[PDB]
Design a protein around this ligand. Structure first.
Ligand SMILES: *CCC(=O)N(CCC(N)=O)NC(=O)[C@H](CC(C)C)NC(=O)[C@@H](NC(=O)OCc1ccccc1)C(C)C
Ligand SMILES: *CCC(=O)N(CCC(N)=O)NC(=O)[C@H](CC(C)C)NC(=O)[C@@H](NC(=O)OCc1ccccc1)C(C)C
Lengths: 301, 301
């Protein structure tokens, strides 16, 4: 027992991280097979990146993999990522896929500086397509991922920090999550919501772990719950959401709509001093899969 | 910016994890050079472990390192750990040290099942020598660690779960943290406290990240603060604690005793609906070093 914001082991990703330097810009690069993927704003000197990239050579790009020079033999822009063809394949390349995630889904971030792993932490993709990350200068190029047995599902690469301290990047094809662009404009995250199905998943994590004080005798229809959800800036709850909670429902014996009734009183009455899994807030950054994995015993290799 | 419960990259530890099986017990083993360290209750069949270990052979112990058999050529008890001498050194052994930590200090846990990494998360050693971990059956043998440049400071190996859902283990010499033993008795964690210097470190993390609403014009002496600390089951604050916060003090310009005054009103008045770094609680599982590392940019390799 216990419940913790837990990341995937980072070792498979640590082996793909590299330092890309061209001009006076240094950022992080992701090395898979013979390509280094990195943010295109590593390119020298409002920008017309196609224009600025024709102006570059291969030798402009200094790729450090630990202590080893990586000779770039080609380059190419893919949306907002750069793809640097190097003469050596990464012998540590894990099995991988580039998969775009939905808001509501979570991933682990390996924050990196100068191609060196710094820390690992778990995030979710916010309804407004930002992420509440932890990133300093030089962190761009650091990737978000999930593991599924032995396969690394790369889903995010980090690009910029928005004025609210939240973070914006792209999937690994260079397509930004959300209405964000890799320049300097007055960009701001849009109004965010709470991920209802994630909060419900976490209430089931609380019940699996013996926290039951918020449980209750009441029930409610889907439509009535949803009337209280929007009132509190919570995402609508769909029937699929309810089916995805089925396993947690059936394991704890609490009907999904019954757990909704409890979320209703929690939203309407607050938490009256108590805590749920050591939190005084309704946590929304655990999916039903995260809960089932942490409270069943699933591994990865 | 941002502030997140961040772990060290786990890759260096992932490479040391192995599955130890003897009898019908399977747990996790830590493979460094030619020794596998593991909890001694892997031993077969209230126990007199010296008695039960003379009754074992080397071949009793099945060590799996991924897909590879590891031949045990010797064994030995060290307090509550077992040391299994194997015929092959771990070529992935990082530079390491076995260091015992103090309550108040933090570490990253690589939870493992059957010798396979499952997740990584950040913990602290509670004042009562437990840890609020996240562990299921078969997790014992999983280690806690810190990284310092390239060196892995192993500090914890996990052994058991206490009735409150909190966790107890040993440093890597087999000496338990706290008055806990590796058998089945009516053991229970003792009354815990809050790590004051850690909460103050986190208030500075909040101020470094733009959360300032709890700041205030007031000051207080050390003795007066400590009168309010004990009243709220908070650890006493020593002068050394204040010196260890010096850098955070000097970086934000807020005197340590001034930050104490703010912690006083927070304890006495609560948080009045607001949140600090996205928490509705006063967090105590970040040390001053954790804050400085996350809000300066430090890496490890
Ligand atoms: C690649 C460098 C890096 O490490 N970045 C991540 C920084 C972080 N803390 O997440 N990325 C940047 O520093 C980028 C570099 C550009 C070439 C993309 N710049 C930023 O993220 C700035 N943010 C920003 O400009 O957002 C748009 C904006 C501009 C003006 C007013 C409001 C919003 C940030 C200030 C460093
Ligand atoms: C090594 C097996 C393992 O995975 N463990 C970690 C379990 C966990 N969730 O952290 N360890 C155990 O299961 C140990 C095995 C013993 C051989 C050490 N057992 C426990 O942790 C039990 N806890 C326990 O007995 O605590 C003492 C106690 C006994 C009776 C009443 C109150 C307290 C636990 C019930 C599995």
């Amino acid at each position: 027992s216990g419940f913790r914001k837990m990341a995937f082991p980072s070792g498979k990703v640590e082996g793909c991280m590299v330092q890309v330097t061209c001009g006076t810009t240094t950022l992080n690069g992701l090395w898979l097979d013979d390509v280094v993927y990195c943010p295109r704003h590593v390119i020298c000197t409002n920008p017309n990146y196609e224009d600025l990239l024709i102006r570059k050579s291969n030798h402009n790009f200094l790729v450090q993999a630990g202590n080893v020079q990586l000779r770039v033999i080609g380059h190419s822009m893919q949306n907002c990522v750069l793809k640097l063809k190097v003469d050596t394949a990464n012998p540590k390349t894990p099995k991988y896929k580039f998969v775009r995630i939905q808001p509501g889904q979570t991933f682990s971030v390996l924050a990196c500086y100068n191609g060196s792993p710094s820390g690992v932490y778990q995030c979710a993709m916010r309804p407004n397509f930002t992420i509440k990350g932890s990133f300093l200068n030089g962190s761009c190029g650091s990737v978000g991922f999930n593991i599924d047995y032995d396969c690394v599902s790369f889903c995010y690469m980090h690009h910029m920090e928005l004025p609210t301290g939240v973070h914006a990047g792209t999937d690994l094809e260079g397509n930004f999550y959300g209405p964000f662009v890799d320049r300097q404009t007055a960009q701001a995250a849009g109004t965010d919501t709470t991920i209802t199905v994630n909060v419900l998943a976490w209430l089931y994590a609380a019940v699996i772990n013996g926290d039951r004080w918020f449980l209750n005798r009441f029930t409610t229809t889907l439509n009535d719950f949803n009337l209280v959800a929007m009132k509190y800036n919570y995402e609508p709850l769909t029937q699929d959401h309810v089916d995805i909670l089925g396993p947690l429902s059936a394991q704890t014996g609490i009907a999904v709509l019954d757990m909704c009734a409890s979320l209703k009183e929690l939203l309407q009455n607050g938490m009256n001093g108590r805590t749920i899994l050591g939190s005084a807030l309704l946590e929304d950054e655990f999916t039903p899969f995260d809960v089932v994995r942490q409270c069943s015993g699933v591994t990865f290799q």
